[PDB]
Design a protein around this ligand. Sequence first.
Ligand code: HEM
Length: 82
Amino acid sequence: AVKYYTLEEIQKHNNSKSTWLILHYKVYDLTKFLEEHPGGEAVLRAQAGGDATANFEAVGHSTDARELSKTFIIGELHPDDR
Ligand code: HEM
């Protein structure tokens, strides 16, 4: 299978580096994208844990981003979260 991650497991990644989150039932590791991500390592690290779909969408982001995200996809939201 793909190995989905629970909101909890994703929630464990919210300290300094470990920065995961859920964007439309999809998990994106951006731990090695903090300093890289133009928004500035802050909003990403803060919204880390999950429930950033609205935040991500609120920014809008472009096609390039939408595609990049897929390259950063680590899996999907656990089938026991939804
Ligand atoms: C799925 C992974 C993500 C990728 C690949 C990504 C990529 C990008 C890129 C390329 C930009 C440039 C803006 C543009 O012209 O489109 C950007 C800006 C931005 N992103 Fe992301 N992003 C991701 C996730 C997030 C998340 C989860 C948040 C919310 C916590 C976020 C918040 C922002 C903000 C605040 C900006 C700057 C807008 C501003 O305040 O001026 N991004 N992102």
